[PDB]
Amino acid sequence: QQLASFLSGTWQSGRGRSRLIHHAISGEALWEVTSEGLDMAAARQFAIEKGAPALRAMTFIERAAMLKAVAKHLLSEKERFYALSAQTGATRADSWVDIEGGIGTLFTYASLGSRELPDDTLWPEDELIPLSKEGGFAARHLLTSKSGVAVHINAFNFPCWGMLEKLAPTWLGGMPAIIKPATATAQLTQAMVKSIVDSGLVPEGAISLICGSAGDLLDHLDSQDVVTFTGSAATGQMLRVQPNIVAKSIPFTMEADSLNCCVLGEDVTPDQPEFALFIREVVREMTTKAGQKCTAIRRIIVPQALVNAVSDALVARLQKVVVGDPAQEGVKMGALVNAEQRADVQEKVNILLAAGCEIRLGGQADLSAAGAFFPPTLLYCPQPDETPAVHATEAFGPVATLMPAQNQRHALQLACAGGGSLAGTLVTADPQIARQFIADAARTHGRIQILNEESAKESTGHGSPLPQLVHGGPGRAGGGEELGGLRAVKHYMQRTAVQGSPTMLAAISKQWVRGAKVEEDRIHPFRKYFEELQPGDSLLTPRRTMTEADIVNFACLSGDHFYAHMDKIAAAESIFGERVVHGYFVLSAAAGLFVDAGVGPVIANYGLESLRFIEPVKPGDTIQVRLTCKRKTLKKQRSAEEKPTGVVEWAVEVFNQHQTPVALYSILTLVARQHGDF
Amino acid sequence: QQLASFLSGTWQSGRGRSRLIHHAISGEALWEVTSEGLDMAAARQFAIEKGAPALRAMTFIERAAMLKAVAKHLLSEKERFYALSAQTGATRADSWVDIEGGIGTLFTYASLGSRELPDDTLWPEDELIPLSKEGGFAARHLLTSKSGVAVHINAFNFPCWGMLEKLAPTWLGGMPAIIKPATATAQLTQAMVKSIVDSGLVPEGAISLICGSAGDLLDHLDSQDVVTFTGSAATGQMLRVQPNIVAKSIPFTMEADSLNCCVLGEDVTPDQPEFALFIREVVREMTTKAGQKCTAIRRIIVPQALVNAVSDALVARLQKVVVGDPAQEGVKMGALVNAEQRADVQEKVNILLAAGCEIRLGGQADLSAAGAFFPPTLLYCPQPDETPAVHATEAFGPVATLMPAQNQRHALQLACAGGGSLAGTLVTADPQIARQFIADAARTHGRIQILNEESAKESTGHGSPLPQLVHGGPGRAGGGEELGGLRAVKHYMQRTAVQGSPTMLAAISKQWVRGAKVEEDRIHPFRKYFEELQPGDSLLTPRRTMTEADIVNFACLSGDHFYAHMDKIAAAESIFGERVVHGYFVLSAAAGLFVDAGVGPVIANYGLESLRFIEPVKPGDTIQVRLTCKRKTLKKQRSAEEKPTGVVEWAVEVFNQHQTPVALYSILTLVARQHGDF
């Protein structure tokens, strides 16, 4: 039975040599895959001339609303995904992660990119860099989307998560994606892609899928393309030196295997509650998803006097795990995915047993069953710093080794001897052991969890990549970063420094900056709706003289009898030389000068973004305020009962009779719209 | 005569086959370089075990003061540097840019790190990420420093600027450096390194130099190292695939050659001031440094109806240029650096002449004189969209080519046809033309200048990299980035998401976060000096009941007669339901509860960082304020007369009688120190 590929808008299939997909709990072939004789250059050409100009013609807010709509469409028909995921040998709780945590990444990116990204095709990330003495020459940074494709090469662990966490920043950035999943579990990836395509939510050409080898795709890419890899450390170092990639200098993000430590602290005795949650965390992280997640604990570093207390407490917790079929009852651990995986785990277990020891059911594995089972395995290594095969070999199954250390200076070296890891855990209760651990072992790790009694109630775990924390690590773990929040949408964009006059930078960025021309238009700017405000609508307020009575009235009403405002002997010895006006009174009298009183489109204020007081204000000194619209960035009206609205930022500039700018700042405002959208 | 290399603390010299450094304006050989038989593993050993812990034990503020002291020490003895730089064939106005821009890079990276970096060894870049529903589990991102070396490989253009723009983020990030300069002009780099080392300002092992070939250094590196390359594309694509770099996955940042454009807008006619500054900018950028900078204009795109006038004015402007010895008077353009450069520019000029045309003195360059000169060359290409050898071949001299376009849609394609560039220029006066140019041609450029009459009076130039703007480009320009501000010190660091309880993240980051434990002291925190404030010192103030008269008094004193505070009919038809207390009165009455009225260590306030109003405050509602210290970050007392001080940040949290957090924010304060440092 053929597995199709979505190329050039059409479902196609290959002709020729083929591989095939076995069932995991029984072991018969129920799909067979090939991609031979298909045109890859035409697929890239259709992607570039069709899906890239459609995505690059949207704002970021529309591109986040598209992600929320696709997420709501894929959440409803979720039960046709659990049926395909049970064929991979996973349980129900171990497939809940793969389905729901991969769909929740879309909701996370839709909520992030609607509150923090502009309503434009470009995205100015900085404020302003003044590069002159008068103010006629400045610069600022911009981020524009590339005009190519993003080629993703996934693994076999998470077909629903690992495809779809690389795809929310790709669509949110403005590029069309081509997915090449692993050919051992591609039948879930095809169902995901088919549910995306057959809904009419994304534009055409914005997603493509190849099932089988890519063949002749990396030899056709241009310098506006990006490539992301996820797999072992032996394939990605062959794909890094591919001559088109090093010729055209295209971004290649490699991310590979790792050895993830879990260090027990010196301040832990077996009567404390730390020991039980340590054992629980190690057992859960070693038995979840049959040990087939990349963020699993594989090196357990314990102190010397607590080895026999740990190695006896793990095994009694581990013998209660019943390995078998996930559909029948009483079974917690499922199976592996292939017989090749059952061979490849045990051929690494034998390499570890060439210099290690044995605590449980290790190299015993039934290599002739109709089902990819492997028993949970705990090893031991009494010479940790004289056996380099422990610190370089990961058995990608339920296997983890145990080794001792000596008082927080040998453990800090055994944790850094992994050569670049992907995750780490420390179990302590002393907050000055965690500081010494972070100051020396955060170089090799990309995510570190400190675990104690308070954190363990609502912790997500050692091996759960959150979609707003950096997922990556140096050295052996590839050297790339994913999922850093909005750090991941910047891997699909070009950063540019634009220079010129401020009145030109304001027209490029569609935001008034500081020195641009203004537009005074004879009616008050708080009387306009959202659709008739443009960035650069300015108001010059009338003046107000700050007298000596104003200082006394504000200090009486507020309560701030500070010595630079109320005393006279001590005011003549400070930095100001005499007693001055309060800063919050300047802040309040400014708002008294520009705020309109009548009922209009302005609803709420709720914000003050960045205030700096520059020069002091004295009695006998006037105040005049300039109010300028700056940024518009509407909201999406998630229901039909609600009111259409948007959020306008106004820049406020105060100055005295000498026109020098005391106290310049910026406020937020929620302005109602005339025409709704949904 | 030897050229010594400073390795392992000793000035050494090689024994073997050698290359030699000539004189650029006369022709005699006056140095000779070699590095054979030097121990390259021992230099990395000395830098890791001797110089790196001396840098990773300083704070960021001390590492910025070190840069400022080294800059002030190297600015004084600059007159030997001009004498060394005149041997390279450059004028005084071209050596000024090199030497003084190199030292101004250090002044800029000291003045940024003095203001925007903490007083710590670790650097938290986020604020807080709440990952829970109760509040006992959060995460934040840390940046720690790597524990290896930084191998910098430079080019022959800027021996003083190019070394010292890679070295300031390296030293500010806390890593040592090994500089390999280009052996064609390595006599000035050694004088720089000697003037740095013979001052006692930097630690030992913190800087190393190799004059000659690196030989075997790149086979000895580790995953905690970084490599930066600056040169041609054909060399950096051979050093990218070096089998230790791809096996250990170490960061390699290549930055290569580019074909920089300068597009003339359609709305510019020769009776405008734009035309003369266009001609001036092209001629100055082509005749500066004899066209030996990477950010020089090499393709000139003009409209079709203006080819002849531009081709006349450029030749009438360029024939006034005198090429000769720089020391004798009346000479504008200097010389090249080697006879090999004179022989290698013209073999590119002949490749361009295999399909182009000729406007001035090109391939008639005297290849037998004493001193490497080359005449200012202007070319022409009547068929730009059919000759690919214009858009791929660069001549690294005074050579630039000219070509027409057709009404702002062929020019936007000829500007992007370069294959990724390093800089670009548009000369217009219409801001919509600039919007269209940035929206289509910023994908391939890494810095774009828009030039008009306002900008031209104080523009730094087309080809001057500012130290606080991104210097890099996609595609053919390498793909790397440098000089991005504080974006470049993050290339020498590791980012880590640390998870845990807020009382543990507060101990790791040495800053109170949101939910950590507090330390109440029974004396007021505005009475302590800077050396006895700890992050976590908290004050819980008495209460104040917001009555109805307070709304009227604050609205009368400020002048804000807004309808949600003063009108009663329209307040019942708004979102709040009834009329509420002002936001600025909550801000001003919170400050009356925690401010000490007497004279003490607190000097000024001057700041307010992030204010958000959460719930509305009504009449009959009590208010209580919590005030917690957050971050200390002292200042370095630039004189011996000034009072010592630091800048303490407090976090303010207001809540009502239901303890829900109305209006939480954060303020800045300048607090005096007890004991000064200088």
Ligand SMILES: C/C=C/C(=O)SCCNC(=O)CCNC(=O)[C@@H](O)C(C)(C)COP(=O)(O)OP(=O)(O)OC[C@H]1O[C@@H](n2cnc3c(N)ncnc32)[C@H](O)[C@@H]1OP(=O)(O)O
């Ligand atoms: C191939 C390479 C080519 C080139 O680089 S050519 C570069 C051409 N650019 C220029 O000429 C500069 C352009 N100007 C701008 O952009 C201008 O916005 C500008 C950079 C002045 C802006 O003014 P700044 O005050 O920001 O200048 P700096 O950051 O460089 O220096 C400030 C700092 O340096 C100290 N300092 C002392 N003496 C000096 C000296 N002598 N020089 C520099 N800095 C000094 C001084 O104490 C000052 O203390 P603080 O302000 O309190 O931090």
Ligand SMILES: C/C=C/C(=O)SCCNC(=O)CCNC(=O)[C@@H](O)C(C)(C)COP(=O)(O)OP(=O)(O)OC[C@H]1O[C@@H](n2cnc3c(N)ncnc32)[C@H](O)[C@@H]1OP(=O)(O)O
């Ligand atoms: C290998 C893979 C491993 C894993 O992924 S394991 C991941 C484990 N993580 C978890 O289980 C979640 C942990 N929680 C956190 O981290 C928590 O910080 C958190 C993720 C709630 C933080 O809260 P968020 O607001 O960021 O969560 P969401 O943005 O996804 O949900 C809110 C948002 O989503 C929308 N929405 C609607 N339906 C849903 C549904 N059904 N789901 C999500 N979001 C939805 C809803 O309209 C809301 O609209 P707005 O607030 O106005 O923006």
Ligand SMILES: NC(=O)c1ccc[n+]([C@@H]2O[C@H](COP(=O)([O-])OP(=O)(O)OC[C@H]3O[C@@H](n4cnc5c(N)ncnc54)[C@H](OP(=O)(O)O)[C@@H]3O)[C@@H](O)[C@H]2O)c1
């Ligand atoms: N985030 C992470 O760090 C992370 C996440 C998940 C998994 N991993 C690591 O990945 C490993 C398990 O996954 P894996 O076995 O699938 O790794 P793999 O064998 O190296 O293959 C990874 C992907 O590369 C493709 N591929 C293999 N050879 C290729 C070639 N010559 N040319 C082009 N593409 C090729 C594969 O497709 P085919 O199957 O068709 O060959 C597969 O999709 C584990 O070591 C695990 O630690 C790491």
Ligand SMILES: NC(=O)c1ccc[n+]([C@@H]2O[C@H](COP(=O)([O-])OP(=O)(O)OC[C@H]3O[C@@H](n4cnc5c(N)ncnc54)[C@H](OP(=O)(O)O)[C@@H]3O)[C@@H](O)[C@H]2O)c1
């Ligand atoms: N920021 C930028 O984009 C930028 C800046 C400046 C210059 N450039 C470009 O650089 C070019 C001019 O510089 P260049 O001619 O000096 O470049 P290059 O000759 O090709 O080489 C650059 C550096 O690489 C070293 N190198 C060469 N072969 C090597 C090998 N086999 N192993 C190790 N190192 C080796 C050279 O040292 P040796 O000289 O001792 O052999 C030199 O220091 C121009 O094309 C210019 O556009 C770009």
